[PDB]
Design a binder for this molecule. Sequence first.
Ligand code: HEM
Length: 153
Amino acid sequence: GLSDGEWQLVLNVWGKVEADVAGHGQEVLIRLFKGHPETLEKFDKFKHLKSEDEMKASEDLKKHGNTTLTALGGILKKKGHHEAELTPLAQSHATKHKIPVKYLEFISEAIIQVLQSKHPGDFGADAQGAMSKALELFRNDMAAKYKELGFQG
Ligand code: HEM
C-alpha cells in the first residue's frame, strides 16, 4: 500500500530494531502499559506489575516483547502481501486473547514512540511517515480479518 520507496524506509528502520529486538520489545510494552493501563489487564502474568521499575525488571515482559516484535517484523518484511502471516495473528487475538482493534492502535503508537526515543537521528520525517502508514495498513488488515471472523465486538 506504500510506495516501494516507503517500504524501503520501513525495512531500513526495522534493521535497527533487528539489532536489539528484545530491548525494543520491552520498551514498547512498557510504553503501552504506561500509556494505557487498561491493556495490562489483558496479561495474566503482568497484571500485577505496579510500576515501571517492576516492568523493567520482568524477564517475562522482555520475552513477550521479543515475541511480539519478532512477529511484527515477519509481517513488515512481506510488505503488504502479508495476508498469510496476519491471519493467524488476527485469529488468536480476536478469538483467544480478545484484543480490541483500538488496542492495536495503542501499540502502533507505542512502537512509533520507542523508535523516536531510541533513534531520533535515524527516524526522521520520512521514516516516521512510512512506518506510520505501514502500522496503519497492519491495523486495517487486522480490522478487516476481525470484521470477517465477525468481531470488532
Ligand atoms: C503489533 C501487534 C501485535 C503483535 C504482532 C502480537 C504478537 C503476538 C504473538 C506472536 C503472540 C503469541 C502467539 C498468539 O498467542 O497469538 C501474542 C500473544 C498475546 N498477545 Fe499479542 N501482539 C500484538 C498486539 C497485542 C496487543 C495490543 C495486546 C493487548 C493489549 C496483545 C495481547 C496478547 C496476549 C494477552 C497474548 C497472550 C500472551 C501470553 O502468551 O500470555 N497483543 N501476541
